[PDB]
Every structure is written in structure tokens, then in C-alpha cells.
């Protein structure tokens, strides 16, 4: 790998073929370490050169056992979950609940939303998860932060009853959840983009928020 520039040359087909032989030999020897470490590189860098057949084969053969044997303790891309939008539902008429207001010169004319929740109004947390690969995985569970933790979290039993969230091959599939609130904030606007997720029974890894292109789309509560 050092002879090439896997980690001066940009022959992606050749680099893919070398990485394929590398993982194949690493599995030929009883070494579950570099098989994992190179499969991660192969299916994070050269993901738009493998056809569906080889991608499915590689995922079922060399990456899935890497999941089972606790070889990798993270996820491959940071580009998952483009959109993280949140809202509040008005089940009754608008008048039922309203937001408090919280109570000889010279003129010249030549010179984002702040989400609000009362304390317990039922909210709605909709996140759009994008699958770039040619195989379909599943999300196990979702969590928020430590800084804004225990403030407006999603309900653990709710997500558990909802069960594992499959995501299709190339989709931008959405997940909608309820959201409980249990603490006030007085006057201190707090951000929400830490957003821990588990994927395929892995440890809950942090994932930031990324729009269509790099700009961090932050909303705050």
C-alpha cells in the first residue's frame, strides 16, 4: 500500500484491485485485524466503482464477520443523516397553547428560526438517513448528546418498540420519532447537533449534521 498512495497516483481501478488482493490475503492468513482495517478503507473510499454484485458479496463475506468479531468500533462515513428537522404538533386548536412573550435626531435607512417548546407539548423529530452503498443496513437506536442530554431526548422504550429501522439500498429514507421534554432552560439557547446513532449493533457513535454540500446545518432549541 505504501508504494501506491492509498493512505502521486490516482489510478482508482488499480488501487481497488490491490486492496481486494490485500483483504483476500489478509483473510487467507488468520488475521481478522487488517481484513477489517482494509475493508473499511475499501468501502469508504472506492464505493462508486464496485458494482452491486461485488458490493453485496464483500459486505456479506468480509465486513459482516468484522461486525460480529468486534473488530471495528466505529462507522465508515461521517456523511450519514443529512437532515435533522424537528417540530411541534398542535393537536388541539391553536388557542389551547401559546408561546409566552417573556416580558431631535437624524434617521438613516442606508445601513434563523429559534425552536421553542413550552415544557411538555408533544414534539416530532424527523431525521433523513442516506444510504450511499449498494446494500441495506439497519439502525438500532438513537441518542442525542451529553450537553443537551436529559433535556429533550427521544424515548428509549418508544424507539425499542419501533424496532430496528431498515434503510434501503440508495434511499434517503426518513425516520420519525416522538420526543419527550423534562427540564426548562430559562434563557440559554442550546444547539442540537451531536446526534449519536448505533448502526448494525455497534457502539453509539457521534455523527454531525451535513447538508447537501461542507456546511454544518445547526438548529437550536
Amino acid at each position: 500500500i505504501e508504494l501506491l498512495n492509498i493512505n502521486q497516483s490516482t489510478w482508482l481501478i488499480l488501487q481497488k484491485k490491490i486492496l481486494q488482493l490485500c483483504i483476500k490475503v489478509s483473510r487467507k492468513i488468520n488475521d481478522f485485524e487488517y481484513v477489517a482495517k482494509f475493508s473499511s478503507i475499501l468501502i469508504t473510499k472506492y464505493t462508486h466503482l464496485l458494482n452491486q454484485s461485488e458490493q453485496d458479496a464483500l459486505f456479506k463475506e468480509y465486513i459482516q464477520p468484522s461486525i460480529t468479531n468486534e473488530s471495528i468500533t466505529s462507522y465508515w462515513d461521517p456523511f450519514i443523516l443529512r437532515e435533522v428537522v424537528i417540530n411541534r404538533i398542535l393537536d388541539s386548536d391553536p388557542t389551547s397553547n401559546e408561546i409566552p412573550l417573556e416580558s431631535q435626531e437624524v434617521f438613516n435607512p442606508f445601513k434563523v428560526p429559534i425552536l421553542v417548546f413550552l415544557v411538555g407539548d408533544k414534539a416530532e423529530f424527523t431525521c433523513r438517513v442516506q444510504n450511499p452503498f449498494k446494500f441495506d443496513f439497519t439502525i438500532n437506536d438513537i441518542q442525542l448528546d451529553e450537553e443537551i442530554s436529559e433535556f429533550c431526548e427521544i424515548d428509549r422504550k418508544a424507539v425499542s418498540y419501533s424496532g430496528p429501522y431498515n434503510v434501503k439500498a440508495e434511499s434517503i429514507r426518513s425516520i420519525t420519532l416522538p420526543l419527550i421534554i423534562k427540564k426548562p432552560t430559562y434563557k440559554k439557547i442550546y444547539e442540537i447537533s451531536c446526534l449519536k446513532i448505533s448502526i448494525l449493533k455497534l457502539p453509539l457513535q457521534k455523527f454531525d449534521i451535513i447538508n447537501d454540500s461542507c456546511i454544518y446545518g445547526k438548529l437550536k432549541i
Binding site: 497516483s9 490516482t10 489510478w11 488499480l14
Partner: protein, 146 residues
């Protein structure tokens, strides 16, 4: 058959193609199909070595490298573009390269590269993704290569 490629200074291909002869239209059987990029990458080193030397024409290098019956020929243009190709047997021969047909082939392919380099939207790193270029190169291959 034959397998021809155009490669830039950063050692990435901007074009690759393979020509049969209609007797065995699957081309190189199954293993040389996998082995073409690596043998050509090997030959690239010798092409680079001859790139900067003294010794008449020096754009056309002719037979530069050898392998299991593969004749590897190369041509260097002015921007470091390397036009390199490998000729194989018809499943049994001691294949030899023409001295003028491939010369003129590289002359016209370099003509095509020169005139498709000029347009402002084409960068050196990006590949030559042009159906007109592909059609012109293959109809040239029919006329000159064999």
C-alpha cells in the same frame, strides 16, 4: 488483440480501450484481462525512464518492454501524456509490431488529443469522456492497427 491507453503526468489514465480482431472477439482470455493494467503500469516506469534522455525523432519509442508474448509500445507527447499499448498473440504467435502503422496511429491519436485539449472546460485530471473521441479512435484503429 490489443489494449491501448492514454495516461497523464499524475499517473492516472485519461483513456483506455481494447481492440479485438473478430476471430476471438472475447479478447485476452480471462487472466490477461485482469493483468493488463498491472503490466501497463509496469511498462510506465521504463517509459518514464526513456522520457528524459538524449537519443532524430524521440516521441515514438517502439518496443520498450516484454512479457509472455506481449509487445509493449509507447509514445510520449509534450505534456508528459503517455500513449502506451500492449499487443498480444492470436492465441499462438511471436507477435511483431509494425514500424510505420503504429507511428501514424500515434500521430493521429495525438492530433485528436491536442484538439480535444483546447476547449476551456477540459481539465488535465478529468478523463476524456467523449463519445466522439471514442468513435474517432476506434475507426482509426480499424484503418491503421490491423
Amino acid at each position: 488483440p490489443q489494449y491501448f491507453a492514454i495516461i497523464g503526468k499524475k499517473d492516472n489514465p485519461v483513456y483506455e480501450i481494447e481492440f479485438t480482431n473478430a476471430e476471438n472477439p472475447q479478447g485476452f482470455p480471462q487472466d490477461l484481462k485482469e493483468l493488463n493494467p498491472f503490466i501497463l503500469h509496469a511498462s510506465l516506469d521504463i517509459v518514464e525512464d526513456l522520457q528524459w534522455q538524449i537519443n532524430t525523432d524521440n516521441c515514438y519509442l517502439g518496443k520498450v518492454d516484454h512479457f509472455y508474448g506481449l509487445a509493449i509500445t509507447a509514445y510520449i507527447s509534450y505534456s508528459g501524456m503517455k500513449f502506451v499499448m500492449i499487443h498480444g498473440n492470436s492465441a499462438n504467435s511471436s507477435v511483431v509490431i509494425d514500424d510505420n502503422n503504429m507511428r501514424s496511429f500515434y500521430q493521429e491519436v495525438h492530433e485528436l488529443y491536442v484538439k480535444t485539449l483546447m476547449n476551456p472546460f477540459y481539465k488535465i485530471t478529468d478523463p476524456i469522456r467523449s463519445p466522439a473521441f471514442d468513435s474517432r479512435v476506434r475507426t482509426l484503429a480499424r484503418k491503421h492497427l490491423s
